[PDB]
A paper describes a structure:
The essential ClpC1–ClpP1–ClpP2 proteasome complex of Mtb has recently become the focus of several drug-discovery campaigns. The NTD (amino acids 1–145) has been studied extensively to determine the most critical residues for the binding of ClpC1 to several natural cyclopeptides with potent anti-TB activity.
The structure of the potent antituberculosis macrocyclic depsipeptide ecumicin complexed with the N-terminal domain of ClpC1 (ClpC1-NTD) is presented here. Crystals of the ClpC1-NTD–ecumicin complex were monoclinic (unit-cell parameters a = 80.0, b = 130.0, c = 112.0 Å, β = 90.07°; space group P21; 12 complexes per asymmetric unit) and diffracted to 2.5 Å resolution. The result is particularly surprising as structurally related (although smaller) hepta­cyclopeptides such as CYMA and RUF-I bound with a 1:1 ratio of target to ligand while occupying the same binding region. In the structure of the complex the nonpolar sides of the ECU molecules face each other across the intramolecular pseudo-dyad, which provides an additional hydrophobic surface of approximately 240 Å2 (15% of the total) for the second ECU molecule to bind. In site 1, the polar side of ECU (including its three-residue tail) serves as a very effective ‘anchor and guide’ to induce a conformational change in the four N-terminal residues of ClpC1-NTD (Met1-Phe2-Glu3-Arg4) and form an extended chain that distinctively differs from the short 310-helix found in the ClpC1-NTD–RUF-I complex. In the ECU complex the N-terminus is extended and the peptide tail swings around it, making significant contacts. In the packing of the long and extended asymmetric unit, clusters of three dimers arrange themselves in a looser hexameric arrangement. In addition, the SPR data on the mutants and the multi-site binding of ECU to ClpC1-FL provided further strong evidence for the unusual stoichiometry of the ClpC1-NTD–ECU complex (1:2) in solution.
Numbering used by the authors:
A (entry chain A): 1 to 144
B (entry chain D), C (entry chain E): 1 to 13
The structure:
Amino acid sequence: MFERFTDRARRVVVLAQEEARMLNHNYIGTEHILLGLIHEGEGVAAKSLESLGISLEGVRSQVEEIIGQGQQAPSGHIPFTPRAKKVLELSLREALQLGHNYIGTEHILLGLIREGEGVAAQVLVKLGAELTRVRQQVIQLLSG
Amino acid sequence: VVXTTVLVVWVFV
Amino acid sequence: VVXTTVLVVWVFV
């Protein structure tokens, strides 16, 4: 109970909404959480990717090519898709597995992958970001 | 250990 | 345009 999102993880989600605004999308999907993850580009999630050979601007144009752009930009709140909601919930499940009592960008990466159906997961696994592999780069990196 | 999935201001209860 | 960034029930306010 009471697991807190890190201030870095919170930014990823705030960023997720704006990525979708820039693209004129009227939703926040898993892809925009991955763009947010990329946009803050600083956490354990970003280093776990780069440390596996994955270029975060490669990821960004890969995702941007798949989802395109919207006609016009919407206002106020843009709703999170259910599967984007399920990423954040799988982040907590991935943090707990490791025995962590917080949710940071590392766990958001794992939940994006574990979600296993969205644009973000499809892009990630095409680039070796396999779950158990990313789990291990997360653990060795976190050791300290 | 006890898991709650309400998202409430960035914390899961 | 008012763009609050507190997350309430999955909605920003």
